[PDB]
Design a protein around this ligand. Structure first.
Ligand code: NAG
Ligand code: NAG
Lengths: 40, 40
């Protein structure tokens, strides 16, 4: 029985969900318009 | 002696030079400007 993964105050699965220990990396990609007047 | 290739009236090397029998193919390549106002 894998009842170890629950959201109970006293469990280590609730500790990972309240505070995520692993960082999240987000890379913002943009688009640069080269011919702006020609689109008009 | 390869005196056969001369420009004498009576030779077949002068016939190739007066009138070139082999066609010449020329392909004209152009450049099209995509962002003309942005160069200005
Ligand atoms: C979790 O830990 C104890 C358990 O009773 C409690 O005192 C504490 O307030 C709880 N935390 C939250 C956010 O409920
Ligand atoms: C070549 O051929 C004869 C050779 O005498 C002559 O009548 C003719 O005029 C010559 N052609 C030219 C362009 O000189």
């Amino acid at each position: 029985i894998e009842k170890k993964i629950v959201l109970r105050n006293g469990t280590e699965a609730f500790d990972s969900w309240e505070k995520p220990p692993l960082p999240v990396y987000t890379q913002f990609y943009f688009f640069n318009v080269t011919n702006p007047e020609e689109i008009l």
